[PDB]
Each structure stands twice: as structure tokens, then as C-alpha cells.
Amino acid sequence: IPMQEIKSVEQQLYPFDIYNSLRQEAPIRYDESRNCWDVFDYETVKYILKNPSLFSSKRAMEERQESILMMDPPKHTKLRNLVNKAFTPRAIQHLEGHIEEIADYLLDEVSSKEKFDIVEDFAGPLPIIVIAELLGVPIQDRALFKKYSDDLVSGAENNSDEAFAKMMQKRNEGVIFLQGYFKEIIAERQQNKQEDLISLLLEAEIDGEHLTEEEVLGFCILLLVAGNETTTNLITNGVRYMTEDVDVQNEVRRDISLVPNLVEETLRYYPPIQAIGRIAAEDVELGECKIKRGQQVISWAASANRDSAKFEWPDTFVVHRKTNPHVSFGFGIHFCLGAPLARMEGKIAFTKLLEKGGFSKVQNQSLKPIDSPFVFGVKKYEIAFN
Numbered sequence: 001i002p003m004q005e006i007k008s009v010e011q012q013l014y015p016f017d018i019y020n021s022l023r024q025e026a027p028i029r030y031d032e033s034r035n036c037w038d039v040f041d042y043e044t045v046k047y048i049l050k051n052p053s054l055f056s057s058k059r060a061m062e063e064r065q066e067s068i069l070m071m072d073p074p075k076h077t078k079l080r081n082l083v084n085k086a087f088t089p090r091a092i093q094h095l096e097g098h099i100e101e102i103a104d105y106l107l108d109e110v111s112s113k114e115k116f117d118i119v120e121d122f123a124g125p126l127p128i129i130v131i132a133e134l135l136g137v138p139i140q141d142r143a144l145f146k147k148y149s150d151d152l153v154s155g156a157e158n159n160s161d162e163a164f165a166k167m168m169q170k171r172n173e174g175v176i177f178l179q180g181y182f183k184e185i186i187a188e189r190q191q192n193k194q195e196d197l198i199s200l201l202l203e204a205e206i207d208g209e210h211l212t213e214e215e216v217l218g219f220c221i222l223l224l225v226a227g228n229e230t231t232t233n234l235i236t237n238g239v240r241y242m243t244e245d246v247d248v249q250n251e252v253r254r255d256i257s258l259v260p261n262l263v264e265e266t267l268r269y270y271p272p273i274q275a276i277g278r279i280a281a282e283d284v285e286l287g288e289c290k291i292k293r294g295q296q297v298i299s300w301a302a303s304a305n306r307d308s309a310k311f312e313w314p315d316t317f318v319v320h321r322k323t324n325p326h327v328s329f330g331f332g333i334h335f336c337l338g339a340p341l342a343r344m345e346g347k348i349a350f351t352k353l354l355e356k357g358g359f360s361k362v363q364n365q366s367l368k369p370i371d372s373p374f375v376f377g378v379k380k381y382e383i384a385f386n
């Protein structure tokens with residue numbers, strides 16, 4: 001359910017001027033229609049995230065509990081600490097070759113094609129293949145794995161009651177499949193360990209505590225939910241920017257060391273996740289606004305990422321920033337566990353693309369935004385190499 005200031009399709013595809021205006025009028029505002037507080041300014045987004053005691057990640061138990069994302073300390077702290085070791089930049093760095101092999105593979109499958117969808121053909125599959133490798137999905141089981149991960153976040157045929165129904169069947173059908181499949185794999189690895197993440201998670205120990213199989217199960221479902229579409233949107237949003245501003249593409253193709261800046265600046269400018277939800281746990285005054293216990297507090301990273309108070313040239317895509325303290329991965333204790341992996345898949349994806357040569361956006365597409373108003377990315381983006 002989107003905010004009323006976002007009217008057309010073209011605004012969903014570039015709402016940043018809208019959010020910027022809103023940030024100037026009211027850094028905090030209550031939207032009666034959506035029954036929530038929106039926060040647009042960086043300093044107050046940072047503060048919300050940095051104070052889990054005031055602003056909670058907990059959710060109504062009717063909605064699913066996506067593992068650590070929807071926990072508060074002290075529980076969140078214990079579980080994160082058990083899954084942490086596997087996601088640091090050093091821990092995953094060794095995957096660079098495999099991720100390179102995959103991106104090479106995916107681009108080789110579209111060589112004689114004169115145009116292709118970066119989503120379906122490249123950016124969508126890369127995270128699925130990688131997290132499959134990482135988790136320990138055998139290669140021979142990827143097809144169904146990919147299929148229901150795809151199904152997990154599928155769009156709709158229309159925004160009706162009929163197609164929203166159909167989609168939610170499909171999504172939920174995938175969560176069920178994936179819960180069954182992992183439950184099967186967790187169990188497999190529970191009694192015979194393999195050289196993979198699921199096994200590594202089962203063996204973790206901190207203060208004598210282990211994760212339960214159900215915690216590993218839920219964490220594995222989270223990695224797909226949290227890790228696939230967002231990374232896919234990173235690669236696609238980046239390819240989108242690099243075809244909207246070709247000089248940026250060509251600058252980075254010539255100084256390939258700029259790709260890490262390209263990735264952070266894509267995250268800042270075209271953030272795959274544009275908003276973070278919290279439920280207020282106490283009454284708290286933000287500026288002059290009186291936020292009450294129980295109220296929903298949406299912090300907009302896409303607005304925050306462009307705050308004149310924190311970022312120079314906030315509406316200009318710059319690959320030479322000295323710091324890029326966006327909140328596209330959040331901030332604080334819930335800071336994306338997958339940022340090193342997303343940053344590496346992002347880096348490799350952009351590199352292989354640039355090394356293949358110039359590429360351009362294909363003429364006369366109807367760019368279709370992702371349905372959620374918390375997500376920023378497109379369902380399809382056709383490009384062509386020259």
C-alpha cells in the first residue's frame with residue numbers, strides 16, 4: 001500500500017524527488033491514510049535504527065517470524081551472533097571465483113542474443129545460484145530451488161483481487177516447498193555434515209548454546225527472502241543507472257577499481273530497499289512529533305540517502321565519494337548480514353558486464369516497478385551489448 005504522494009507509475013520508478021520534497025516540508029509526518037509515521041531525514045532514520053529498545057523489530061505473531069529480522073535483543077543478539085561468522089567479508093571472500101564462474105556462465109548464455117532481460121537472464125539467477133552453493137543445495141536440485149525462490153516474490157497478472165490472490169497462492173506455495181526442502185536438507189546435514197553453510201550453522205556454538213534446527217530453517221528462508229530480490233535489484237538498479245548515465249558506466253569500465261564505489265553509490269541512489277519498518281515500543285519525542293507505543297515508524301532510506309545534511313551532491317550519481325554512509329543496508333544491530341555477499345555479487349556482476357563491453361538500454365520498454373512500495377526495482381530491464 002503506497003503513499004499518496006506517489007501517484008503515477010513514473011513516480012514509483014523515480015520517487016526520490018517526491019521524498020526529497022517531503023523531507024524538506026516534514027522530516028517526520030503521520031500519514032493518516034497508511035496509519036504510520038514516515039521519517040525522511042537521515043539523522044532521525046539513523047536514530048530509529050540505532051535504538052531497538054525504543055523502536056522494535058518485533059511483529060504480531062500471526063505474521064511469519066522471519067528469523068532474526070523480526071527479533072529484538074537479547075534474543076536477536078544471541079541468534080545473530082551464532083550466524084555472524086559466516087557472512088563477514090573474509091569468510092565469504094573465497095567465493096569470488098565461483099560467483100565469477102556463474103556470472104560468466106549467465107552472460108555466455110546470452111551471447112548470440114542481441115538483447116536480454118538483465119533480471120531473468122542474469123541478475124535474478126545470480127543470487128539464487130550463489131546462495132544455493134552457499135547454503136549447500138546440490139546442483140541437481142537447483143531447478144526446483146530456483147523455481148520456488150522465484151515463486152517466493154513473484155508479481156501479479158493485474159492489481160486485482162483475482163491476481164493478488166493467485167500470486168499469494170504462488171508465493172505461499174513456495175514458502176511451503178522451501179520449508180519442506182530445507183527441513184529435508186537441514187536434517188540430512190544434521191546427521192552428516194557437508195562443506196556448506198547449513199552444516200556450519202548447525203555446528204555453531206556461543207556460550208554453549210546452539211541454534212535449533214527450526215532456527216536454521218527460518219534463517220535459511222530469511223536468506224532467500226532477504227537476499228535474492230534485493231541483490232537482483234542491486235544488479236538491475238545498477239545496470240539501469242549505468243544505462244541512464246552512460247558516462248558513469250564508461251568511467252567505471254576504464255577504472256575498474258571504481259566498481260566498489262559504483263556498488264555503494266547504486267545502493268545509495270537506487271536503494272533496493274527504500275523503507276525500514278519498526279513498531280514504537282515506547283512513547284518517544286522525535287523533534288516535535290509525539291510517537292506513541294504501538295505505532296508503526298517507517299524510516300525511508302531512499303529519502304535519508306539523499307539528505308543534504310549527510311551527503312554531498314545527493315541527487316548526483318558520483319563514483320568518487322570518500323565515504324558513502326547510506327542506510328541501504330540499515331544501520332545498527334540489524335545491519336544487513338548479507339552486505340559483504342551483496343557487495344561481492346554486486347561487484348562481480350558489474351565487472352563482468354562492463355568487461356563484455358558497452359551496453360545500452362533497449363528502446364521502448366514499459367518498465368514495470370515492483371509492486372511493493374518498500375522495494376525499489378523493476379521486474380524487467382532489457383539491455384543490449386554494442
Ligand code: HEM
Nearest residue numbers: 068069226227230231234272328329330334336337338342
Ligand atoms: C543489495 C542487497 C541487499 C539489501 C539492499 C539488503 C537490505 C537489508 C536491510 C535494510 C536490512 C535491515 C532491515 C531492518 O533493519 O529491519 C537487511 C537485513 C538483513 N539482510 Fe539484507 N539486504 C541485501 C542483501 C542481502 C543478502 C544477499 C543477504 C543474505 C544472503 C541478506 C540478509 C539479510 C539478513 C539475514 C538480514 C537480517 C539481519 C538482522 O535482522 O539482524 N541481505 N537487509
